[PDB]
Amino acid sequence: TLNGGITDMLTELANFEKNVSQAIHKYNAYRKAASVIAKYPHKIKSGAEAKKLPGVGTKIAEKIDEFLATGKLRKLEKIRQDDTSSSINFLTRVSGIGPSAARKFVDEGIKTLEDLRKNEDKLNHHQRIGLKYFGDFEKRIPREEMLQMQDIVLNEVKKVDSEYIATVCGSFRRGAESSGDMDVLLTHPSFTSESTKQPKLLHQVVEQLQKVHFITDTLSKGETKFMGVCQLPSKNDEKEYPHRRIDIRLIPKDQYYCGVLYFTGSDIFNKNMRAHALEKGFTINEYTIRPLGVTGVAGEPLPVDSEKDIFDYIQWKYREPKDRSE
DNA sequence: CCGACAGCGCATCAGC
DNA sequence: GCTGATGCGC
DNA sequence: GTCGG
Numbered sequence: 001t002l003n004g005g006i007t008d009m010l011t012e013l014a015n016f017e018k019n020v021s022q023a024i025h026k027y028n029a030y031r032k033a034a035s036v037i038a039k040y041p042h043k044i045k046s047g048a049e050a051k052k053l054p055g056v057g058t059k060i061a062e063k064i065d066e067f068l069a070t071g072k073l074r075k076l077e078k079i080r081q082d083d084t085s086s087s088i089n090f091l092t093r094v095s096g097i098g099p100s101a102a103r104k105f106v107d108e109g110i111k112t113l114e115d116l117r118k119n120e121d122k123l124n125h126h127q128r129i130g131l132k133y134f135g136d137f138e139k140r141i142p143r144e145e146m147l148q149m150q151d152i153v154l155n156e157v158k159k160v161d162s163e164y165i166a167t168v169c170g171s172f173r174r175g176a177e178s179s180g181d182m183d184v185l186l187t188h189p190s191f192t193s194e195s196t197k198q199p200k201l202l203h204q205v206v207e208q209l210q211k212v213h214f215i216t217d218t219l220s221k222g223e224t225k226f227m228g229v230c231q232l233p234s235k236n237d238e239k240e241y242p243h244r245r246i247d248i249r250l251i252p253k254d255q256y257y258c259g260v261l262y263f264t265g266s267d268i269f270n271k272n273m274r275a276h277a278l279e280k281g282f283t284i285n286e287y288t289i290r291p292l293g294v295t296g297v298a299g300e301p302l303p304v305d306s307e308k309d310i311f312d313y314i315q316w317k318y319r320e321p322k323d324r325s326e
Numbered sequence: 327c328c329g330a331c332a333g334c335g336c337a338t339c340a341g342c
Numbered sequence: 343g344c345t346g347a348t349g350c351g352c
Numbered sequence: 353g354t355c356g357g
């Protein structure tokens with residue numbers, strides 16, 4: 001982690017602007033700068049050297065000089081001493097609680113894990129589950145565990161219908177030795193951009209996973225996107241595995257490539273790639289890659305048959321999943 | 327010195 | 343009931 | 353907070 005010190009400062013700053021300042025752009029700005037720095041193959045010796053990287057400006061340049069000069073950043077040392085900011089930051093760590101709900105709870109006197117446990121009646125379903133699994137969701141998932149999970153999801157999928165195609169994406173597909181959660185991309189021949197022949201496609205898949213006790217809870221659930229919890233099965237008498245977050249997204253079969261490009265990420269990567277697309281005159285989403293008319297309006301979907309094809313349309317050398325971790 | 331910053335599914339609410 | 347703005351998340 | 357124009 002050549003510049004682990006600096007990227008942490010930045011990430012902390014991004015989290016602050018997002019959770020406490022509710023300044024989403026500043027948030028993204030720091031994330032981007034932290035991303036470009038993380039891949040910079042040199043140990044940064046100064047804020048000037050860093051400012052040469054696209055994304056780092058005069059403000060981050062100074063913060064970096066200050067950090068390198070003392071190993072600390074005053075603005076952050078203070079933020080850490082502000083109870084309100086500490087509470088808001090902490091509450092946002094619970095799935096379902098955003099900057100808004102956090103600042104609210106703080107106002108109503110709720111600002112500790114304990115305060116939340118006694119006011120479960122003031123949380124919506126999602127916030128309740130997030131609170132319930134707070135601890136577990138903090139633990140990372142070892143790849144070896146992701147592999148055990150993949151077999152269970154894929155095999156349980158096939159058992160509902162041998163025509164489903166379940167693909168694990170997210171950081172898992174990017175090659176991470178550890179993942180924050182499991183992301184599943186699902187496709188079935190009956191669901192395409194031209195029609196939904198069969199209904200409940202996603203339902204039955206969830207239903208099945210719940211039947212075998214793999215899926216333990218639901219944060220949210222719709223026709224195409226499921227957000228819940230799951231747990232690997234444990235052998236006889238051995239300790240129990242941490243509950244884990246699991247996202248399942250059903251995408252039209254004929255749009256798998258745009259969907260798989262989206263779900264593999266990373267998020268910062270997608271951001272850069274989609275920003276670049278616009279620069280070249282295109283707009284990309286999880287379903288398609290359309291051309292941008294002079295008026296701005298997006299045209300019809302262009303033909304796609306691989307992830308690379310999409311990359312071509314924007315003038316970018318194809319980059320493997322493992323090199324998309326920005 | 328300005329406006330843009332990627333794109334979208336779900337839960338929830340206010341209003342009609 | 344619907345529509346659309348908001349919060350929160352991928 | 354940063355950047356292209």
Ligand SMILES: O=c1ccn([C@H]2C[C@H](O)[C@@H](COP(=O)(O)NP(=O)(O)OP(=O)(O)O)O2)c(=O)[nH]1
Nearest residue numbers: 170171179180181262263264265266267270352
């Ligand atoms: O803001 C977002 C969030 C996610 N995504 C896409 C890309 C990301 O890789 C994918 C999965 O989302 P996760 O939040 O699961 N992140 P990821 O799997 O990359 O990392 P990890 O789960 O290990 O934190 O969803 C976006 O496009 N924008």
Ligand SMILES: [Cl-]
Nearest residue numbers: 023024025026
């Ligand atoms: Cl902002």
Ligand SMILES: [Cl-]
Nearest residue numbers: 072073076077
């Ligand atoms: Cl610090």
Ligand SMILES: [Cl-]
Nearest residue numbers: 255257258304
């Ligand atoms: Cl596609």
Ligand SMILES: [Cl-]
Nearest residue numbers: 285287288301
């Ligand atoms: Cl579309």
Ligand SMILES: [Mn+2]
Nearest residue numbers: 170171181183
């Ligand atoms: Mn993930």
Ligand SMILES: [Mn+2]
Nearest residue numbers: 181182183247
């Ligand atoms: Mn996820």
Ligand SMILES: [Mn+2]
Nearest residue numbers: 136241242243
């Ligand atoms: Mn548990």
Ligand SMILES: [Mn+2]
Nearest residue numbers: 275276277279
């Ligand atoms: Mn570009």
Ligand SMILES: [Mn+2]
Nearest residue numbers: 339340341342
């Ligand atoms: Mn009402």
Ligand code: NA
Nearest residue numbers: 051053055056
């Ligand atoms: Na720069």
Ligand code: NA
Nearest residue numbers: 092094095097
């Ligand atoms: Na949260």
